[PDB]
Design a protein around this ligand. Structure first.
Ligand SMILES: C[C@@H]1Nc2nc(N)[nH]c(=O)c2[N+]2=CN(c3ccc(C[C@H](O)[C@H](O)[C@H](O)CO[C@H]4O[C@H](COP(=O)(O)O[C@@H](CCC(=O)O)C(=O)O)[C@@H](O)[C@H]4O)cc3)[C@H](C)[C@@H]12
Ligand SMILES: C[C@@H]1Nc2nc(N)[nH]c(=O)c2[N+]2=CN(c3ccc(C[C@H](O)[C@H](O)[C@H](O)CO[C@H]4O[C@H](COP(=O)(O)O[C@@H](CCC(=O)O)C(=O)O)[C@@H](O)[C@H]4O)cc3)[C@H](C)[C@@H]12
Ligand SMILES: C[C@@H]1Nc2nc(N)[nH]c(=O)c2[N+]2=CN(c3ccc(C[C@H](O)[C@H](O)[C@H](O)CO[C@H]4O[C@H](COP(=O)(O)O[C@@H](CCC(=O)O)C(=O)O)[C@@H](O)[C@H]4O)cc3)[C@H](C)[C@@H]12
Ligand SMILES: C[C@@H]1Nc2nc(N)[nH]c(=O)c2[N+]2=CN(c3ccc(C[C@H](O)[C@H](O)[C@H](O)CO[C@H]4O[C@H](COP(=O)(O)O[C@@H](CCC(=O)O)C(=O)O)[C@@H](O)[C@H]4O)cc3)[C@H](C)[C@@H]12
Ligand SMILES: C[C@@H]1Nc2nc(N)[nH]c(=O)c2[N+]2=CN(c3ccc(C[C@H](O)[C@H](O)[C@H](O)CO[C@H]4O[C@H](COP(=O)(O)O[C@@H](CCC(=O)O)C(=O)O)[C@@H](O)[C@H]4O)cc3)[C@H](C)[C@@H]12
Ligand SMILES: C[C@@H]1Nc2nc(N)[nH]c(=O)c2[N+]2=CN(c3ccc(C[C@H](O)[C@H](O)[C@H](O)CO[C@H]4O[C@H](COP(=O)(O)O[C@@H](CCC(=O)O)C(=O)O)[C@@H](O)[C@H]4O)cc3)[C@H](C)[C@@H]12
Ligand SMILES: [Ca+2]
Ligand SMILES: [Ca+2]
Ligand code: NA
Lengths: 282, 282, 282, 282, 282, 282
């Protein structure tokens, strides 16, 4: 059976940027087919409607098993309109978002939607005097390192791989939809790291990453004096850079014990596992 | 006047992943509107045709001024199908690709296509024993850091901003389409870095990134013994990690002189410029 | 004139450890004389009363111009007794504390006490399974680096040097007593750093150090499962370690421009200033 | 059974700064009670005398089992007065000092004093043109890191804990007083590091720290031209900063093996021990 | 029996610089005696003939078992003259060189010469505007780190130790002469590294080192505009600096597992082996 | 005129290993010609006599203007024999050595010999259990980095370039011969570093490097228990590794200001100078 999904991307988060690719890292899965649509970085209600409309138009002929909407702040006007359209639709849907999405977590459950809210997927320092395209990309690189090397992306991979398997025995029910909130403490319930200091360095990374969001918000939405807000937003980016270095330190620790967890997909979609470098994944 | 474009993403490159977002880094441009479609990681001919078809379907109503196709290896069967379908459409089109795209550079010119071929946008170590989703994301984080902090993304940003300006006075002709090959030596014709060591560090980063591709190719397509190819692909990833460190080093040098170039967009899409941290961009 | 003060140390904070020594870094000031008393790490009401009583007993013959009480949490039972005793006494007094001291800020003003509340002076991960003497000392080393290299200790130095000068013209009144709250944003009102990236790195360090306190508090007072709280408190120490790296990075940036601010005391107590390595302080 | 001690602190050493705190790292020991008195950084005879007087004064009511004097250069005039007064008193006493103390080691034996002479507890670069309060604090941060992560502070904790246990059966004789000289080679007789490379790095750190003293002495007491002495004393601080990095590297090697020794006190004062992160100390 | 050899050094390579010393690292071998002659950095035909004539002049009385010629580019005019002269002589001879020596590999076999060609022994950025004595030495320090810490020097040591053993059993034949080409992939056939990430980091270092040569060649021999060639040659040196960092990182990983391979010579020349720091070599 | 010299190398020092190559870094000097002879690492009296005899034999035809003997410890039996032979000869001679050479400094002046004694050129940890060929090469890489990046090699370059120019006007007299002792404080009389922190970091590196020798000497010649001497010699190597890192940091600070001193030779042997990366040396 081939599971089918549409991913809708409006605005940008680290998680929404990678979410589809985490499911087919070598493009060799024979049990999935995806379509990805969006309006790039714009996430006003008009653009989001356009994005969802594209999805639903494609869905008529594509017949996806589920639809994923990903981007910043599920509580905002654009995303709320996506939640409304997708909840109304015939397709099971999952909302990928960040910490501001916690405001509408009960509402999403009421709407019959799944969610994965990634608290460390922090808003960047979006002031013109600081954030140009290069800086935006630098931040995203650091963030992606954090989300990957800490194990957060493996949490997201697993949630969708479970959903996909349910899709393969058809009708995914509301009870099958992910309802996850990911943060520093998520690592406490997992066995990502063989070395306890790699895990605590990864937790520190995630804490810092989550703390970045409040600094960005202060600099973007509260502070009005540029002599203050430019340094504030830039400090958030320095924090993210060091979160990434901690994530890197954690991963090097694992390397030192030849204990880096890898969980690749087989061509039939089965999630394999290994820890030793030269061990075949099984 | 609002420029419209559709971006098509099949497969993954560092450049293709970021290309649309580099043009509207704070989502505050009023002079652009984009649609993004694709088939995620899959870039076989059937997937690519489905992607291009989605794009052209949307184009009927959206009326883009140009269309961008981005992904690995323009010379491969899937991308070759996109090039012909795009070349045969009524829309001006640009192909974003990597070093393997040089093999069809003359063909693309004959097809009346633009291109941006990014030689440091190197193929990763795509063997199951090594590349899981997390490793894939870690590699992409390092690469993004390289392409951003070396100034490659600014080269791309500028090529598209120039094209967008032409789109607004409307007559985008073949002569207007970008025809760029980016590598280490690209930096020699730019003024990215105030500090010359920053520039040479960045050139080293790009050279290393470019050399990554040959290691990955050997590991994925030539070497057939896993006791050899797993170490080979893994070594490519260690190289990219150090390319990203050099890119970071270069950026910190610019910080030490308060000379980090920032070129943000104004709401009307004008590209602004600054070097000093507290200087307003203009 | 020779200014005289008694410093009372109950419990440990980075600022209270160093506060007296910041005022006479080479022991060559001829205009000050200090006594230091305390009960080491213990700050229960009984110990604190014993400490303050030692101070007041010495004060009879020493005749200090002011008395400083330093240590964790001004709102806690032990420190609350010291505030009560000092507010009752004839001596002007200043309370050095941390962020939990904010709860009794208005109370302290009503008591006629000065205060310097250092938000980044974060509680450590005080769980027996993790915190041994060596770890305690390690954390203190990281914290002292942060508070020093970010400029916090210069803010404290200044506040006391001003108070000392007022002591030297007799009338220390309640209006002369410091009323400071120090955090990340304190740097925005200062000219500590010649380089703006050094400043924002230092801000990031202070932000992280401040965030350490919440992690420690969660791990020490809220989380009851050791499988959880041991990793949590450890992760707070990993964060502090990186805050110290950031502060180091900032100082090295200043080195690179030969612009490290130094403000040493002359033998008569005047605070001198220099930036250039070979420049005489004046 | 509660052991009581008074600590006297005149001038500043890394070891004297932390000595009392290393004995009750979470303030939960129920078998100890301490008083700490001193004259801050000043250690001329009249200051040290005042300090010892405060101690003896408090002793009459407090009834300590022993008295500890800590600070620079036991052979200097001020500390020599402390040694004389303490030797003459009815209280067992221990002198904490640095390498210059070796000159009066036999004398202290003849006086019936204990001692802990810490050779890597190096004098800093005390020239006005270089040493302000911030630099002094940064040097202290690096030294504290060195003495803590090398295991020197654990040698000190143990000496005192053995002494405290003897105090609890009343019979502290002169034969029970510590007589330690601590340097790089001290690590060879210890079991501190599971990893041999961590041990040798720690050894290297302590060697560099010890050698700092010679550079400081040269810069402060021999060289008289500021064009030479300012760079000399600064070079000493750069050495200490790298000694601290070596000690941190060693600690990170222990974390890679999950073998970081921790020896926390129980509430009853028993010294517990563990290596694995998640294991209870016993 | 005492094996005797003459080493001829014209020009400089990392391998030629160290080759003799790798065979008697503490000068305590009783079974070898070497002479070293050369013309320093100059390797034009006239200089090389002079060097070889010095060797053969000494060889008349010294009676070496073999002769080694080491320096850059076996295929160049100077080295070609050394090959011809040595092939003609009565003495078995080995040519140490770099990747450009591959062009005359079959020729060397035909001449009855041995060779060790070290591809990562890359030409430096020899342009007057960049390469001064200090820069040359810095590059050599980085290269030496690479060749040593990756295990390349161990491969060279082994090759000569085998040849020396054959020298000691009177007859060296043409079949005993080494015929080695060393690169990144050489490590795949060895057991240098206990940790697989140390191995792949060492492979990355060797790959980058080998890629340096192409950048140097482009900068020295192809690019004729100084505005371009100076940055190009400089970027080659930045690449070798990071190759050395990777090599260092690999060695530290081995330290973290107490697994650093050591193969010292015994006084009788036997090559011993150990991994554990405190294990006697045997 | 073409100046001629013979370099004799017996044993190994960082300075002796590089000394001839520092004088002709690109092999393009037309005003010098060198011969290099030696007995590799062996420096017992018979070996050294053989070495010097080779040199004198060559000198009869080569007619050098001066002769350089370089290697460890001028005061040892082997080197003392070279000094005697060279002093007796018709050729001006310079002795390159290390700190132990200071013992025979006056003797060398009485002999009419020049010397360059490099105190930071420290003996390594030559115990079989630790020092294999690889470790020997690693140490030499670190030492070379220290001697190069601190500017020590530039001091040696200049001393020989002066002597060479005097050789070109026939009169090499005893007064012309270098008489240098190089150590940390040598930097104070130079203008090597534009940045004063680069200088002090370099001074720190040289201090540490010089301190290495005492540790090596303790481990190789005093300590007799291998449980002690193996760690001791290994710690010396850890120290040299950090000295190299300090030297690296110093050089990077110079890069951050575009102020790296370069002094290349012109083809006529004139020593040029520049600081800015893109400025021609003059
Ligand atoms: C593509 C980016 N990529 C991302 N990627 C990740 N992984 N996470 C993110 O989060 C990502 N981003 C978050 N976004 C984002 C963008 C904007 C805001 C809103 C913005 O912060 C507020 O509108 C400011 O008030 C704008 O300031 C204005 O006022 C100032 C003065 O202007 P005048 O001169 O008075 O006129 C000036 O600073 C100007 O900018 C919030 C979030 C980006 C779309 C988006
Ligand atoms: C999403 C990834 N993200 C990217 N992102 C960036 N910025 N750049 C890239 O470049 C990115 N990736 C490049 N891609 C990619 C994928 C595949 C290949 C081709 C692949 O390497 C070959 O088919 C291998 O031979 C597969 O080996 C097979 O054989 C082995 C034995 O297996 P058995 O059990 O015997 O059967 C085993 O290793 C197995 O994998 C090349 C490139 C990904 C789509 C894509
Ligand atoms: C000297 C240290 N130095 C400092 N230095 C700085 N610059 N900043 C600080 O802040 C500094 N420290 C803060 N202190 C500190 C000490 C304790 C707490 C409070 C403590 O965390 C709570 O009482 C825990 O709940 C007790 O844990 C207990 O429960 C567990 C056993 O459980 P069972 O077996 O069920 O029974 C075990 O983990 C045990 O420890 C708060 C702060 C230290 C004095 C003090
Ligand atoms: C709080 C510090 N904390 C410490 N902490 C640790 N862990 N270790 C130490 O070791 C610590 N310190 C050691 N101390 C210390 C202080 C002074 C000296 C002595 C000082 O070096 C000599 O008196 C200089 O001759 C004074 O230089 C003078 O002469 C120069 C000319 O000035 P003009 O304009 O001609 O008049 C100028 O540079 C000036 O300073 C030695 C040690 C500090 C108390 C103390
Ligand atoms: C001692 C060095 N040590 C080594 N060590 C190692 N481990 N590996 C090496 O590889 C090592 N080196 C290789 N060597 C080396 C030397 C020269 C070239 C050839 C050189 O690059 C060409 O001749 C340039 O054309 C010279 O350019 C000239 O032209 C420019 C002036 O132009 P205008 O104004 O028109 O007049 C200026 O840049 C000038 O230099 C190649 C290799 C050194 C001997 C040697
Ligand atoms: C090529 C090296 N490269 C250099 N390069 C630089 N830039 N600087 C140097 O300095 C450089 N090295 C210094 N050299 C050097 C060599 C030896 C010693 C003397 C050596 O340390 C003593 O003879 C040991 O006692 C030998 O110990 C023996 O005793 C033990 C046997 O025990 P059992 O069980 O009783 O049997 C064992 O550890 C064994 O080694 C001093 C210096 C090398 C030539 C030379
Ligand atoms: Ca056409
Ligand atoms: Ca007195
Ligand atoms: Na597992």
């Amino acid at each position: 059976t081939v599971a089918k999904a549409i991913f809708i991307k409006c605005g940008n988060l680290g998680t929404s940027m990678m979410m589809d690719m985490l499911l087919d890292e070598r493009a060799d899965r024979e049990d999935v087919e995806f379509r990805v649509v969006g309006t790039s970085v714009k996430m006003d209600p008009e653009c989001v409607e356009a994005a969802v409309e594209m999805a639903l138009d494609i869905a008529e002929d594509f017949e996806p098993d589920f639809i994923v909407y990903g981007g910043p702040n599920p509580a905002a006007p654009g995303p709320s309109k996506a939640r409304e359209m997708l909840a109304d639709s015939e397709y099971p849907a999952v909302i990928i978002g960040d910490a501001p999405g916690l405001k509408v977590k009960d509402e999403m459950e009421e709407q019959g939607l799944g969610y994965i809210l990634v608290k460390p997927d922090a808003m960047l320092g979006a002031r013109r005097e600081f954030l140009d395209p290069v800086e935006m990309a630098i931040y995203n690189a650091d963030l992606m390192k954090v989300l990957a090397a800490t194990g957060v992306f493996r949490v997201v991979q697993e949630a969708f791989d479970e959903l996909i398997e349910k899709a393969k025995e058809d009708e995914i029910s509301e009870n099958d939809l992910p309802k996850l909130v990911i943060d520093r403490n998520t690592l406490l319930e997992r066995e990502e790291f063989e070395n306890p200091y790699a895990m605590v360095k990864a937790m520190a990374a995630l804490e810092i990453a989550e703390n970045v969001a409040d600094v960005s918000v202060e600099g973007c939405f509260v502070e009005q004096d540029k002599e203050r807000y430019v340094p504030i937003v830039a400090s958030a980016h320095e924090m993210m850079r060091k979160a990434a270095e901690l994530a890197d330190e954690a991963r090097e620790l694992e390397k030192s014990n030849d204990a880096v967890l890898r969980t690749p997909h087989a061509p039939d979609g089965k999630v394999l596992s290994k820890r030793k470098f030269m061990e075949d994944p099984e």
